[PDB]
Design a protein around this ligand. Sequence first.
Ligand SMILES: *[C@@H]1O[C@H](CO)[C@@H](O[C@@H]2O[C@H](CO)[C@@H](O)[C@H](O)[C@H]2NC(C)=O)[C@H](O)[C@H]1NC(C)=O
Ligand SMILES: *[C@@H]1O[C@H](CO)[C@@H](O[C@@H]2O[C@H](CO)[C@@H](O)[C@H](O)[C@H]2NC(C)=O)[C@H](O)[C@H]1NC(C)=O
Ligand SMILES: *[C@@H]1O[C@H](CO)[C@@H](O[C@@H]2O[C@H](CO)[C@@H](O)[C@H](O)[C@H]2NC(C)=O)[C@H](O)[C@H]1NC(C)=O
Ligand SMILES: *[C@@H]1O[C@H](CO)[C@@H](O[C@@H]2O[C@H](CO)[C@@H](O)[C@H](O)[C@H]2NC(C)=O)[C@H](O)[C@H]1NC(C)=O
Ligand SMILES: *[C@@H]1O[C@H](CO)[C@@H](O)[C@H](O)[C@H]1NC(C)=O
Ligand SMILES: *[C@@H]1O[C@H](CO)[C@@H](O)[C@H](O)[C@H]1NC(C)=O
Ligand SMILES: *[C@@H]1O[C@H](CO)[C@@H](O)[C@H](O)[C@H]1NC(C)=O
Ligand SMILES: *[C@@H]1O[C@H](CO)[C@@H](O)[C@H](O)[C@H]1NC(C)=O
Ligand SMILES: *[C@@H]1O[C@H](CO)[C@@H](O)[C@H](O)[C@H]1NC(C)=O
Ligand SMILES: *[C@@H]1O[C@H](CO)[C@@H](O)[C@H](O)[C@H]1NC(C)=O
Ligand SMILES: *[C@@H]1O[C@H](CO)[C@@H](O)[C@H](O)[C@H]1NC(C)=O
Ligand SMILES: *[C@@H]1O[C@H](CO)[C@@H](O)[C@H](O)[C@H]1NC(C)=O
Ligand SMILES: *[C@@H]1O[C@H](CO)[C@@H](O)[C@H](O)[C@H]1NC(C)=O
Lengths: 49, 265, 50, 219, 413, 99
Amino acid sequence: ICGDSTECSNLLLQYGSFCTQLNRALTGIAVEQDKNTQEVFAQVKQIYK
Amino acid sequence: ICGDSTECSNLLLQYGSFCTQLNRALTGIAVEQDKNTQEVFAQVKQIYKTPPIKDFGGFNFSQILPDPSKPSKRSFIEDLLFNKVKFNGLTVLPPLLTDEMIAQYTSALLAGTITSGWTFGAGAALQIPFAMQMAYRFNGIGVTQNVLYENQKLIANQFNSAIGKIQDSLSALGKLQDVVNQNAQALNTLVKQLSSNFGAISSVLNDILSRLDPPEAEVQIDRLITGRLQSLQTYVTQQLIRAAEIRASANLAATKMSECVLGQS
Amino acid sequence: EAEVQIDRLITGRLQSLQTYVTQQLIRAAEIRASANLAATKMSECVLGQS
Amino acid sequence: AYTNSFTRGVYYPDKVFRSSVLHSTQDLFLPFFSNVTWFHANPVLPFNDGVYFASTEKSNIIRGWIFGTTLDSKTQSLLIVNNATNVVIKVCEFQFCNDPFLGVMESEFRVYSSANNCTFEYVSKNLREFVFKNIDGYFKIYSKHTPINLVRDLPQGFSALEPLVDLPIGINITRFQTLLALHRSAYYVGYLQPRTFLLKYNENGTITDAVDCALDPLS
Amino acid sequence: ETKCTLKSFTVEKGIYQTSNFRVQPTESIVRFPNITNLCPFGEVFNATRFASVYAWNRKRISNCVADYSVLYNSASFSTFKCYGVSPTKLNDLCFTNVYADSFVIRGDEVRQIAPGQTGKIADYNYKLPDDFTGCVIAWNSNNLDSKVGGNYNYLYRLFRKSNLKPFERDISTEIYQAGSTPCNGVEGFNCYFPLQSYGFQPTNGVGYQPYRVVVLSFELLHAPATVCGPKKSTNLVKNKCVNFNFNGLTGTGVLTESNKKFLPFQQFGRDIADTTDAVRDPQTLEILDITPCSFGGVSVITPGTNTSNQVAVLYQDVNCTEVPSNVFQTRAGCLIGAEHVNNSYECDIPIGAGICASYQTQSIIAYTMSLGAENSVAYSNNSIAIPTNFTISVTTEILPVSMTKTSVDCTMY
Amino acid sequence: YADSFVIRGDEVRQIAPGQTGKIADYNYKLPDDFTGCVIAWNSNNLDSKVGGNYNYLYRLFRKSNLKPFERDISTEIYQAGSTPCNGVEGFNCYFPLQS
Ligand SMILES: *[C@@H]1O[C@H](CO)[C@@H](O[C@@H]2O[C@H](CO)[C@@H](O)[C@H](O)[C@H]2NC(C)=O)[C@H](O)[C@H]1NC(C)=O
Ligand SMILES: *[C@@H]1O[C@H](CO)[C@@H](O[C@@H]2O[C@H](CO)[C@@H](O)[C@H](O)[C@H]2NC(C)=O)[C@H](O)[C@H]1NC(C)=O
Ligand SMILES: *[C@@H]1O[C@H](CO)[C@@H](O[C@@H]2O[C@H](CO)[C@@H](O)[C@H](O)[C@H]2NC(C)=O)[C@H](O)[C@H]1NC(C)=O
Ligand SMILES: *[C@@H]1O[C@H](CO)[C@@H](O[C@@H]2O[C@H](CO)[C@@H](O)[C@H](O)[C@H]2NC(C)=O)[C@H](O)[C@H]1NC(C)=O
Ligand SMILES: *[C@@H]1O[C@H](CO)[C@@H](O)[C@H](O)[C@H]1NC(C)=O
Ligand SMILES: *[C@@H]1O[C@H](CO)[C@@H](O)[C@H](O)[C@H]1NC(C)=O
Ligand SMILES: *[C@@H]1O[C@H](CO)[C@@H](O)[C@H](O)[C@H]1NC(C)=O
Ligand SMILES: *[C@@H]1O[C@H](CO)[C@@H](O)[C@H](O)[C@H]1NC(C)=O
Ligand SMILES: *[C@@H]1O[C@H](CO)[C@@H](O)[C@H](O)[C@H]1NC(C)=O
Ligand SMILES: *[C@@H]1O[C@H](CO)[C@@H](O)[C@H](O)[C@H]1NC(C)=O
Ligand SMILES: *[C@@H]1O[C@H](CO)[C@@H](O)[C@H](O)[C@H]1NC(C)=O
Ligand SMILES: *[C@@H]1O[C@H](CO)[C@@H](O)[C@H](O)[C@H]1NC(C)=O
Ligand SMILES: *[C@@H]1O[C@H](CO)[C@@H](O)[C@H](O)[C@H]1NC(C)=O
């Protein structure tokens, strides 16, 4: 939104926790992606040859 | 949004049906939460009871049958599980089913299984002795049924020890704590968003109103309204996305209760 | 003076259209799961014995 | 000499009760593990943004401070004094001795030589901490009196400072000093910067612990 | 109200949120700090000896609690004019400094103490700026300042080189020089002493008797604040939705005795999520909790307008003792218009916490739903049941597969 | 509708929606969603006479500000203080019209 500008950053503080919410939403779906492939591929205990 | 004030309500009346939509959205979610529970637990016609004896072929179900010396009548393991897990227009409605009722549905599902095997899930409950039902189930996995009758005591001891290990492994439930945590944390943000000006002079609808005259104050009150309506839309959209995830989980639970409790898979 | 008054309408109408489009995505994701269950029941109950 | 504070100079940011609530604030604080000057027994110091100020003794050698921009006439200044009687706040235009002090007969007060145009008056071992700040024409003073079991060295520990005074002066400040009782018959100075802290509140509502959120990655 | 909420003339069975219930508070109880430093004017308005007119006094009233009402209504003042600000609004404003000037003049010279006048007093004794802000007060004092024979101690200046700047003061006593001839400090023609004296008497007509004057001048430099009017208050209550103000804290709610202990400099307490939930009374210094006043949602239970027009009402989570027959208390709120029975049926209209309603016994009733029949399997260690017949049954299952494809044209909308 | 009157020169800025002052408070108040237009022109040569034209009055005291487009031609003695006035002038009992 601001991109290395302090004038914009202090005005962005008047909206509260919008950016904290956005980062929290985006991080939770990055964690889900590793769970997704753990649940498909790591279904075996040993590495058989 | 407004909250008591009257200069706010007439200004918010200018936005149309934005608030009617949000209340409809939240009411649909709340009606879906009772249907989730009805679909998982009310899967039984009658309320079945176990007989006063407990002659089950050496198998011991005492840690999972209901406890008669309690107001809630929960079992030992259901008691272990239950010890591990007003505002600005916000309200919490109670569920339609008490959890006494839920414990009463689960104990009847249990007594149906221990006494009739899988027959009560397809029609009327037909009693069968528990060792013979265990021998029918050994056939279902491709083992010949004298392997059960010649090893009954050992098999019953192994069941009993494995049931004993579960309480120790209990006394895990993070999947149930996450839902509670995410919901409480999303409700705390909505309340904290009320102390932000959104680019007005202040964030409290009186001090803006008792320090300016109407033409001047309406400008700031519209900024406050815009911010507070954006916060509520964010909240409701995320509750809609989070309830569809809980519904897919209750659907998996209903299929498991049908296929793993009322039959052999 | 009409720019300032037209922008107030533009902002509101854009908000309302985008709310409509979000709620349709959320309703279509639910119709999709129902149709996916219907396709499995057609395979497993109509072309087989379950 | 210079010394190291450990966790010192925490004050209640304002009224409003409060209990167990790791509450987060942005304000002017003395950063943890800071570089605090040491003075023995003194000179004109700067102010520039608030001041932490501790002191240690059983007698009373530290007898108040003097503030301002020029510490003389032609501009106004504050004066906070304590003879063996009690505190005397005062705001005039003064003429301050370049080395002002008070004696200990027990006759004293070679501090100033002028008291013109007074715009505010008022009259009426040990570790004694003070936090002085000056915002929007108000000169705020927080303080705390803890008992050491040493005589004159800066100890370690946590102790939050409670607000004392509030003066609607309007005065400009850029410099300050100290006042001592001579011989006729140890003190530190930190400075405050805009930091963000995490305060832990007790169930009675007192601050028992804190976290400086810019010290290290763990914090 | 349900028909209006749905915008229809036929409502089908269900439960509908129709409006809201919000307790109402009355009266505006005020609170503040015990009437302390209220400024002791009784020194400038109650002096034993005033000051001359050519060397007026100048008291700089400072941080205090000023009550201009005791002045305004004292009815002892013959003249009370306010210029920058009408008098009744003085006890509702705050400035940086108030100055009070005091002196004594004749009776008919009180009309030169005003912005923009001329005359021997306003020219060179005491000049008021042209954008004055304060107020001018004056009262007769014949009995105090006038003595038998003549009180020659009240002087005024009657010659000066140039009119005064506003609020300027001149106590010099140099021999005036009217004509061009230099004076050399001795009197004579065109060399006059510059001070004259009112000889006040006890038998002088009004307009020659002495009047005492006080000029209050409110100034506002650029400080952070200062003295101002005295706020009013009342007697806070308890156990009643009220509209309160605690020296700045404006709110609404029920006030209740507390049992928490602030630190002796903390005024009010806050919750997590930052809402005021306790205060301290400024006069008696006791902590009081402020719980949100009653409130919730109102729902209407109807069997359907095609069955009946009777109705029952649920007042979401609220003790059936402050709602404003059948009043019935539920874990979900207070229910009005349905009777509670002891039977148990299958659920019809869901109220909550195990309670449902139906139109059966008529009217509307309450109760606890039924989980289902009661079947008792005759289980034993050597008994079996085997079926001897069967039934062929066929049931339906309905599933949505599609919805309607719509398109919008953003620009045309 | 067309309303007509005469005011000072620097009082023309109180004839506008949402203002305050002795004119807009209690002489002539414009609603807050006004629709029309306001026109004003100097008339020194017509209305001002040598010595003083004392025929143009205005109200300077009223109990409460006017409702928009409300009009008040009464001439009751104002009562500032608490003391009743009884229709005679005096301290805190003022005639309400100035010229
Ligand atoms: C079923 O198992 C439970 C153990 O979980 C048995 O109850 C315990 O029995 C032992 C001795 O066998 C006692 O020392 C414990 O105090 C019992 N725990 C209780 C009563 O909570 C129970 O006896 C078993 N059932 C049968 C029929 O043997
Ligand atoms: C403010 O003034 C009131 C009286 O105007 C004080 O009330 C007194 O309180 C003491 C308790 O210590 C009682 O013994 C007196 O009888 C009270 N007086 C009256 C007239 O009721 C009150 O204490 C004052 N405020 C403070 C903080 O002291
Ligand atoms: C100056 O002091 C006198 C005496 O204290 C005050 O006079 C009182 O005025 C009130 C109201 O008019 C009367 O009820 C009293 O009877 C008067 N006092 C006496 C002793 O009789 C006077 O108000 C003071 N002046 C000011 C400006 O405060
Ligand atoms: C099994 O059940 C069927 C009913 O489903 C019995 O057939 C019925 O017999 C009665 C009396 O004879 C007739 O009135 C009905 O018309 C019959 N039903 C049908 C669909 O034909 C049958 O007799 C039962 N068999 C046994 C061995 O009990
Ligand atoms: C404080 O700063 C001075 C500046 O030169 C330095 O010499 C000294 O070592 C510092 N003290 C500490 C404890 O870092
Ligand atoms: C203490 O110092 C103050 C400073 O002015 C003075 O007013 C006071 O009188 C002193 N104490 C005594 C006992 O003189
Ligand atoms: C301050 O003092 C000086 C010298 O005593 C004097 O000239 C000046 O007028 C004083 N300030 C004011 C505001 O009177
Ligand atoms: C304090 O000093 C600054 C110097 O930059 C000056 O601009 C300011 O006006 C002074 N403060 C006040 C209250 O005058
Ligand atoms: C203060 O806190 C202590 C410990 O947290 C507690 O025991 C005590 O009851 C509290 N209240 C007091 C000392 O009044
Ligand atoms: C609705 O009304 C119609 C005709 O009045 C009637 O046939 C029908 O049974 C009614 N429905 C119910 C549920 O009573
Ligand atoms: C409602 O208030 C009364 C009076 O205190 C109390 O007895 C009752 O228990 C309250 N209701 C509930 C559900 O507790
Ligand atoms: C329901 O049964 C209970 C039994 O405890 C009895 O006390 C109560 O009066 C009954 N209610 C009615 C409405 O008869
Ligand atoms: C009608 O009467 C009211 C009395 O309050 C008065 O103020 C108003 O001006 C009257 N209507 C008109 C059009 O004058």
